[PDB]
Amino acid sequence: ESPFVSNPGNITGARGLTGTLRCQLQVQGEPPEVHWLRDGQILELVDSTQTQVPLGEDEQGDWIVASQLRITSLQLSDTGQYQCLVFLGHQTFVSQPGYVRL
């Protein structure tokens, strides 16, 4: 069952548009890094802001984890299917996708 509480939206518009997509999850224990995927490829080069908030009184309790990806100038190579992915142990979970095109 998915830790993702929310999944990236869609962006759809002109060459040069700036916008954001985000995703959020909730996990038990040490919070994972969030990886942004475009057509199944983890993007190493991104404008991203990741937030971790511990909910319990202890770094081993629950955490909220969010990531925001930003597209500064829309163009063809930014086009695609966007999803967040995390590794919890050896397990993997992918979010519902979002779509960017022109």
Binding site: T20, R22, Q24, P31, E33, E44, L45, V46, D47, S48, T49, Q50, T51, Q52, V53, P54, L55, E57, D58, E59, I64, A66, Q68, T72
Partner: protein, 376 residues
């Protein structure tokens, strides 16, 4: 049911920095950026707390970072730049409980710290906080603490910070995650209004390890209570499971006691929402209790006092723990009052203000450096 209710009001758009038990941060942010990026952070800030960590920005422990902090009511910056660490400490008093704007910014070859738009610190540095890798620019930022043990700061510090942020801005980003999750977790929000002291909701205590050796016990307590009953201050001798000294509210009176026997009583208007000052002084062949300048009558003969003070004297030669706000579930026959305190209180013992951030143990629901007001 408490005779005097306290305000329960919290501000929805705030962030409580003192929520984590250990000076673990309440927020962790990690930035990846595509072009060179200069640190900029701006937040409003309110505390009465004179010491603790506001934020950390940089890479990691033995790398390059800054930490902005409070020491002695004033801002302290610590920096590590390629292996070499440094600390400066400058500017106006911060912990006055009034809102104020703090900016931290990377500018040319300087870091610039501003209070209410006044630059109060400007330090030359050789390097950038963002760490280039692969044409990716990386930075970690934590609020309300640091991501490593405080051992390894340039200069050690107690990072617990009973303080508050609002209207924050990190790197001019438009992410609204922090605001949204504070909204839904009241525990992350601050008292709408704070006044001075420490708040005891009446579910626990703090303790310390203090020496009193002739010998001496002086306590001044400033209190604004919610309830007519509760232990304010006490000593507890673990090995004999005894309570060699206590000062407490009971039914409306204050009692100063040695084990079970009351040495003095003073009347007090506990239920009027007013502040009061309780002071107690004891030493060889002397014990006195004051409430707001007036002295309580002795409850014991001169002969029984010497017996009681000599028992207390005996007790102080062995280890005792000093308790504020309650006792550890002791025998009902140990002391006159064994209940928890509810309300606001500041304590000073042998002429030293007790900082609750420094207790050996503090129950997490006691707020160390602020009290909500009395409820209108």
């Amino acid at each position: 049911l408490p005779c005097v209710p306290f305000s329960v009001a919290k501000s929805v758009k705030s962030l409580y920095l003192g929520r984590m038990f250990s000076g673990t941060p309440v927020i962790r942010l990690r930035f990846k950026r595509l072009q060179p990026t200069r640190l900029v952070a701006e937040f409003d800030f309110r505390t009465f707390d004179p010491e603790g960590i506001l934020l950390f920005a940089g890479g990691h422990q033995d790398s390059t970072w800054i930490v902005l902090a409070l020491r002695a009511g004033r801002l302290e910056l610590q920096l590590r730049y390629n292996g070499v660490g440094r600390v400066t400490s400058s500017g106006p008093v911060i912990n006055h409980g009034m809102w104020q704007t703090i900016s931290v910014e990377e500018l040319a070859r300087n870091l610039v710290i501003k209070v209410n738009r006044d630059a109060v610190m400007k330090i030359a540095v050789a390097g950038d906080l963002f760490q280039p890798e692969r044409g990716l620019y990386h930075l970690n930022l934590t609020v309300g603490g640091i991501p490593f043990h405080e051992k390894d700061l340039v200069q050690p510090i107690n990072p617990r910070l009973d303080g508050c942020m609002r209207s924050w801005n990190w790197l001019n980003g438009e992410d609204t995650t922090i605001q949204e999750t504070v909204k839904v977790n009241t525990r992350m929000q601050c008292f709408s209004v704070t006044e001075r002291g420490s708040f005891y909701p009446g579910s626990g205590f703090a303790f310390y390890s203090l020496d009193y050796m002739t010998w001496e016990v002086e306590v001044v307590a400033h209190i604004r209570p919610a309830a007519d009953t509760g232990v304010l201050f006490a000593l507890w001798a673990p090995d004999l499971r005894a309570v060699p000294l206590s000062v407490a509210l009971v039914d409306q009176l204050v009692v100063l006691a040695v084990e079970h026997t009351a040495l003095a009583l003073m009347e007090i208007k506990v239920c009027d929402g007013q502040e009061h000052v309780v002071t107690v002084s004891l030493r060889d062949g002397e014990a006195t209790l004051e409430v707001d300048g007036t002295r309580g009558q002795s409850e014991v003969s001169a002969a029984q006092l010497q017996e009681r003070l000599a028992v207390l004297e005996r007790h102080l030669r062995s280890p005792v723990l000093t308790f504020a706000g309650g006792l550890p579930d002791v025998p009902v026959t140990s002391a006159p009052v064994t209940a928890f305190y509810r309300g606001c209180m500041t304590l000073e013992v042998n002429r030293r203000l007790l900082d609750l951030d420094e207790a050996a143990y503090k129950h997490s629901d006691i707020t160390a450096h602020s009290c909500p007001p009395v409820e209108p």
